[PDB]
């Protein structure tokens, strides 16, 4: 593994990054956080493939509690809390694809620190 | 790992019954005096287990004349003739280290008829 800070700070940083990239399917950050987050995200999508209680109540600790995602209305305001998304949209979208569902792209360093940045996608 | 197992099957004794830490166990050891071969009888409480394959081990905790004693044996010895569970006790830990500070009427474990 790769530490960046103390323990609990790293845990919170990952529980942050993998909650985006659930909502946007794309993210532009550095190189190391990329590798650790691809591991974590792929490990938190197999839980989207069981869909029962126990997988629900185990996934429900590695996701920022409530982060709305609303692009829908029929005559209503439907709200999707970025976990319900995990169990409603990403899940049924990977049934036949087995492990390994993220792409990492090495783009270009940054202005102030020359930290070689990177992208992350899903298909 | 797989290449060793194939090298270490012919020496795995195969009559050891089931017993999890917390079961009184009588152990028929093997002793050697002069040119004889007696058979001792160490008999206590199973305390430990080092899950290892060929080299799993266990320990027993007797109390003789007010002085605790412990012996640990390899699980696959040829110099142990037999083992025989006697009871079964309610217990919630996998390492009962917390006994060495308890005496008599406080270090008893409830029985289970199973």
């Amino acid at each position: 593994r790769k530490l960046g800070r103390t323990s609990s700070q790293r845990k919170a940083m990952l529980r942050d990054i993998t909650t985006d990239l659930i909502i946007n399917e794309r993210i532009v950050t550095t190189e190391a956080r990329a590798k650790e987050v691809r591991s974590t995200v792929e490990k938190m999508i197999t839980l989207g493939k069981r869909g029962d209680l126990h997988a629900r109540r185990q996934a429900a600790t590695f996701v920022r509690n409530e982060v709305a995602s609303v692009r829908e209305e029929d005559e209503s305001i439907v709200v999707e809390s970025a976990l319900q998304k995990l169990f409603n949209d990403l899940g049924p979208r990977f049934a036949e694809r087995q492990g390994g569902y993220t792409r990492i792209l090495k783009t270009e360093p940054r202005r102030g620190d020359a930290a070689p940045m990177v992208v992350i996608e899903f298909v | 790992n797989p290449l060793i197992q194939e090298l270490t099957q012919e020496q795995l004794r195969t009559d050891i019954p089931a017993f999890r830490p917390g079961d009184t166990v009588r152990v028929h050891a093997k002793v050697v005096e002069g040119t004889r071969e007696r058979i001792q009888l160490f008999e206590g409480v199973v305390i430990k287990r080092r899950g290892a394959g060929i080299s799993e081990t266990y320990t027993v905790r007797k109390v003789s004349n007010g002085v605790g004693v412990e012996r640990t044996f390899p699980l696959h010895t040829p110099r142990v003739a037999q083992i025989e569970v006697v009871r079964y006790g309610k217990v919630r830990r996998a390492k009962l280290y917390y006994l060495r500070a308890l005496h008599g009427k406080a270090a008893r474990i409830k029985e289970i008829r199973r």
Partner: protein, 122 residues
């Protein structure tokens, strides 16, 4: 692992109760001592009566350490205490009764007059 300035116990009917080691005879600077190795100690506490008293220099032997020897087969012994049994330079004890088990490793050292008195020889 029993070295200088450490406290054994008397497992005998000789008159002493505690003890504090002095040396680990045998070698030219040895540190420790295990089951069945001789020792030089001087009484610290004592019961009234007895042939042994405070401030006496005596030799003793180590029975049942708290990290016991290994058996050549692959088993171990690990008691709960340490203890010693006083001696007269001829492997012959002074007291006339022994309490508490003793480990087997004495039979290999001509300490016979002891084992014939131990209630349990583990």
């Amino acid at each position: 692992m029993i070295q200088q300035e450490s406290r054994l116990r008397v497992a005998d009917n000789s008159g002493a109760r505690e003890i504090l080691t002095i040396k680990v005879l045998g070698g030219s600077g040895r540190k420790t001592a295990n089951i069945g190795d001789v020792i030089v100690a001087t009484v610290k506490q004592a019961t009234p009566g007895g042939v042994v008293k405070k401030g006496e220099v005596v030799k003793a032997v180590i029975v049942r350490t708290k990290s016991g020897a290994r058996r050549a087969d692959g088993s171990y012994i690990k008691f709960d205490e340490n203890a010693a049994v006083i001696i007269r330079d001829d492997k012959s004890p002074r007291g006339t009764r022994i309490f508490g088990p003793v480990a087997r490793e004495l039979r290999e050292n001509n300490f016979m007059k002891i084992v014939s008195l131990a209630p349990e020889v583990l």
